[PDB]
Scaffold this active site. Structure first.
Site, mmCIF file in Angstrom:
data_model
loop_
_atom_site.group_PDB
_atom_site.id
_atom_site.type_symbol
_atom_site.label_atom_id
_atom_site.label_comp_id
_atom_site.label_asym_id
_atom_site.label_seq_id
_atom_site.Cartn_x
_atom_site.Cartn_y
_atom_site.Cartn_z
ATOM 1 N N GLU B 128 67.584 96.885 125.723
ATOM 2 C CA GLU B 128 68.029 95.901 126.709
ATOM 3 C C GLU B 128 69.327 95.135 126.421
ATOM 4 O OE1 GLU B 128 64.615 93.467 126.820
ATOM 5 O OE2 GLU B 128 63.250 95.096 127.385
ATOM 6 N N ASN B 170 67.473 102.104 125.181
ATOM 7 C CA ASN B 170 66.344 101.823 126.072
ATOM 8 C C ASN B 170 66.578 100.553 126.901
ATOM 9 O OD1 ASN B 170 63.496 102.555 126.796
ATOM 10 N ND2 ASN B 170 63.014 100.578 125.837
ATOM 11 N N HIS B 207 59.493 99.909 134.741
ATOM 12 C CA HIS B 207 58.440 98.947 135.033
ATOM 13 C C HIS B 207 58.640 98.686 136.526
ATOM 14 C CE1 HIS B 207 57.244 98.081 130.917
ATOM 15 N NE2 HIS B 207 58.510 97.926 130.574
ATOM 16 N N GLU B 236 58.293 103.168 129.182
ATOM 17 C CA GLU B 236 57.323 102.076 129.298
ATOM 18 C C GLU B 236 56.770 101.963 130.714
ATOM 19 O OE1 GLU B 236 59.039 98.481 127.773
ATOM 20 O OE2 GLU B 236 60.125 99.514 126.164
ATOM 21 N N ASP B 238 54.705 101.577 134.049
ATOM 22 C CA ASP B 238 53.588 100.866 134.660
ATOM 23 C C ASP B 238 54.017 100.584 136.091
ATOM 24 O OD1 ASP B 238 55.282 98.522 134.086
ATOM 25 O OD2 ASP B 238 54.050 98.126 132.322
#
Lengths: 427, 427
Positions: B128, B170, B207, B236, B238
């Protein structure tokens, strides 16, 4: 009055109560809702046998009085729950039988009722005395084994202890007229009335779920009992899923029966419920009103496309798109699927069958769009009688940005103002 | 195989992983699912900077190693997360700036990678580094203030520490191609690749929620980065609400790009999620496979009326009734709403628009009926590729009682036997 449940119920001479747990009287969010919305209170556990007489002959009213005092000081009457029951008996009472038990029961009834004499509107004298096996007979308990006439005795005792309180028989799974249990209870009250046994009301717990669903013949059951000369009351209402239609139907059934004194929901917020997993109540964990709350209120007060009042245009999904994240807008009304919204019992506004009106946040300016339906509170709405549409999670109103009225005007969430760009009508 | 996520992904040369929390490894319900379904593991917090270097120069790998040992003992590969980040820094590092911080960053990388040298498949070297302000520029942090070249230095350092590991950058909100952040990251990778900076992969956290929804152009985003000569991975994943279509869509996007290494969902059960309130994972709190689980498995494996095979009849609501509690049955097929079922992204089988195929229990013989839709797991079903319909909550199959085949045959829940009276085809 008609902005609260209690007040809307009072308009027709009825009440709307809840179950109060003394343990939560310290929670400010809890009491704020309870003191405002209800005018009838039932102690969830504080007045049970094990709580009022821990030791044989040794009465303790600490918890019960805390609930009673809070109720009265906040303008609510109280239902006494409960005097004779096979469940939650103290350790000592379980170790009793014959005339000994029959005597303990009598002493308990005189002790509890004596303490609250003239202060309780209704008492659930006997609780859950019938079986669920499907026979329609008494359930096998230490109380039943002391003599089939124990119920009659409890009521005669209660009448003598406090002739001012209405004496009720309370039970569950007796709402559907066709069930054997319902018939068992009916025949007993029928017998009682003829033999002059002092019984004033019958309480229908009304615990509805997919295992024992609400059935429209519930109104017939209420009417049949009322016809025997007894009052009827919905004592522990909760509905698995909290369907808006079902909650409204139950309310209307009571309103349609002059002998129906009122409705009590078993708890304040879903998180306070003994069955929280079923989200069976009218307020959710955040203390915000659910879609069912609005349906019940409208029912108490009142005995497709969505068009904006200020614009004359309809809630539209641009170019009949189905992609998640597409913000809705105002557009000339016409019979297209991208303008047909369905308001579900869960409180969603669905389009295309499986897309939900969705709020991507909770503050002013939040854009209103469509997203896959999944059950979030940001996808649930309340259609108020005043024409406003409020988001359950945010408590904000559907708002046509800047008060625009032309095609393409976007929709957002904004603090409710009763403006014409926040008023809608269904066609 | 093709009965578990990991095994299915391996059929296309890919992996399917999850994030593991060492504190939950003692929970057998947790580990049973984890070891069985995934073949790639990321430590949810154990390999972060504060966990691996609590004091300057004092490395601690006790937490990280518990996750690592579990992974390899159970045949899983490991993704390292993460080496350089503005978040979750130890107190001593938050106090550093300038060249002192720059050197501490380098020291941290060498220490952690030296410990796991040759044991890690991928490392999220930098995490990030870009801003969410819409400028497409770097995020302001102590690391960025050491100099714009900090990211490059982190990568060159990592390559020398462990030449065997794939080095990934990432980030989140870089899935939609039109976003400035996405393109800012694209330009950095292009620059690195042109100047010879060692970077092997780009991880898309992915996400998704209604505030930042999945968009089909995500596939072009993946192709564009892959075209630069780097591998891509969903690191990651979701999805708020766990829509089946969306989960399947993301899976197919990775399968379409030869360079997409695999997919990692951020957690095992919804209750293990950092966003449990959004129930964004593939298993519910009880550890049951959700409707989305089957959607992903089917996509990995290459993947109206509901007619029974052994009977040849359609799932039918008796007399086109809409009363809750009505048991469903088999009956001569024919175009009628009471035989039209819609399977939603949530996994419900709807009829009449707002009624749901409902299970009134969790054991064999349980009555399958219709009831107001509300989102309970007892109203959710999984449509297996073998033709069976399994209840999410009970894990039992839709069963035509006794194997009947005539009209009026009742539907129940029974242990899945793959019998012909448990197989259904879509019409």
């Amino acid at each position: 009055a008609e902005s609260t449940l209690g007040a809307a119920a009072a308009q027709s001479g009825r009440y709307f109560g809840t179950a109060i747990a003394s343990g939560k009287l310290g929670d400010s969010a809890y009491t704020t809702i309870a003191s405002r919305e209800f005018n009838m209170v039932t102690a969830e556990n504080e007045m049970k046998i094990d709580a009022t007489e821990p030791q044989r002959g040794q009465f303790n009213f600490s918890a019960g009085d805390r609930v009673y005092n809070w109720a009265v000081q906040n303008g609510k009457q109280v239902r006494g729950h409960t005097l004779a029951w096979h469940s939650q008996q103290p350790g000592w009472m379980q170790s009793l039988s014959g005339s000994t038990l029959r005597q303990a029961m009598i002493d308990h009834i005189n002790g509890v009722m004596g303490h609250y004499k003239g202060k309780i509107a209704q008492w659930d004298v006997v609780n859950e005395a019938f079986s669920d096996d499907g026979s329609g007979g008494r359930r096998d308990s230490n109380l039943q084994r002391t003599g089939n006439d124990w119920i009659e005795v409890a009521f005669r005792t209660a009448r003598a202890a406090d002739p001012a309180a209405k004496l009720c028989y309370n039970d569950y799974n007796i709402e559907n007229w066709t069930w054997a249990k319902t018939q068992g209870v009916y025949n007993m009250v029928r017998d009682f009335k003829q033999r002059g046994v002092p019984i004033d009301c019958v309480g229908f717990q009304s615990h509805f779920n997919s295992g024992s669903p609400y059935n429209s013949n519930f109104r017939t059951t209420l009417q049949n009992f009322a016809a025997l000369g007894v009052d009827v009351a919905i004592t522990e209402l909760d509905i698995q899923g909290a369907s808006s239609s079902t909650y409204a139907a139950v309310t209307n059934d009571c309103l349609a029966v002059s002998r129906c004194l009122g409705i009590t929901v078993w708890g304040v917020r879903d998180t306070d419920s003994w069955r929280s997993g079923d989200t069976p109540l009218l307020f959710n964990g955040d203390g915000s009103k659910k879609a069912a709350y609005t349906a019940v209120l409208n029912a108490l007060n009142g005995g497709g496309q969505i068009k904006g009042v200020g614009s004359g245009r309809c809630l539209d999904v641009p170019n009949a798109s189905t992609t998640d994240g597409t913000q809705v807008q105002l557009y000339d009304c016409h019979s297209a699927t991208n303008q047909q919204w369905t308001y579900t019992d869960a409180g969603e506004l669905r389009v295309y069958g499986d897309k939900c009106l969705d709020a991507a946040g909770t503050g002013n300016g939040t854009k209103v769009q469509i997203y896959s339906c999944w059950g979030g509170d940001n996808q649930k709405w309340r259609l108020n009688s005043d024409g406003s549409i409020v988001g359950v999670q945010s408590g904000l109103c559907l708002d046509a940005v800047g008060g625009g009225t032309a095609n393409g005007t976007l929709i957002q969430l904004y603090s409710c103002s009763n403006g014409s760009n926040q008023r809608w009508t269904r066609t």
